[PDB]
Design a protein around this motif. Structure first.
Motif, short mmCIF file in Angstrom:
data_model
loop_
_atom_site.label_atom_id
_atom_site.label_comp_id
_atom_site.label_asym_id
_atom_site.label_seq_id
_atom_site.Cartn_x
_atom_site.Cartn_y
_atom_site.Cartn_z
N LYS A 1 98.36 -0.72 -48.50
CA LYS A 1 97.51 -0.38 -47.19
C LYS A 1 97.23 1.08 -47.22
O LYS A 1 98.27 1.92 -47.14
CB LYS A 1 98.16 -0.92 -46.11
CG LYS A 1 98.16 -2.44 -45.81
CD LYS A 1 96.78 -2.71 -45.42
CE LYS A 1 96.65 -4.34 -44.94
NZ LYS A 1 95.28 -4.84 -44.92
N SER A 2 96.25 1.47 -47.41
CA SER A 2 95.73 3.02 -47.42
C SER A 2 94.16 3.16 -47.18
O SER A 2 93.46 3.02 -47.93
CB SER A 2 95.93 3.66 -48.85
OG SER A 2 97.39 3.88 -48.95
N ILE A 3 94.06 3.45 -45.90
CA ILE A 3 92.79 3.70 -45.37
C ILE A 3 92.36 5.24 -45.37
O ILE A 3 93.29 6.17 -45.29
CB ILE A 3 92.54 3.32 -43.96
CG1 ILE A 3 93.63 2.20 -43.47
CG2 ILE A 3 90.94 3.02 -43.79
CD1 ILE A 3 93.52 0.93 -44.45
N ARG A 4 90.95 5.54 -45.18
CA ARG A 4 90.65 6.86 -45.26
C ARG A 4 89.69 7.10 -44.18
O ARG A 4 88.29 7.10 -44.32
CB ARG A 4 89.95 7.33 -46.70
CG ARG A 4 90.09 8.81 -47.08
CD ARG A 4 91.25 8.92 -47.80
NE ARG A 4 92.64 9.42 -47.29
CZ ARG A 4 93.40 10.06 -47.71
NH1 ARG A 4 93.74 10.22 -49.05
NH2 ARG A 4 94.52 10.37 -46.91
N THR A 15 87.82 2.91 -46.19
CA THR A 15 89.23 1.98 -46.67
C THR A 15 89.57 1.53 -47.89
O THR A 15 88.76 0.96 -48.57
CB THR A 15 89.17 0.72 -45.66
OG1 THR A 15 88.47 -0.35 -46.01
CG2 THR A 15 88.68 1.01 -44.24
N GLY A 17 92.69 -0.50 -50.47
CA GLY A 17 93.57 -1.57 -50.51
C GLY A 17 93.38 -2.70 -51.23
O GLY A 17 92.32 -2.81 -52.21
#
Length: 17
Positions: A1-4, A15, A17
């Motif tokens: 899980k890694s959003i921007r 987003t 992932g």
């Protein structure tokens, strides 16, 4: 899980992932 997500004049929401 890694959003921007960022806020500011001309900022886009991304987003990963």
């Amino acid at each position: 899980k890694s959003i921007r997500i960022q806020r500011g004049p001309g900022r886009a929401f991304v987003t990963i992932g």
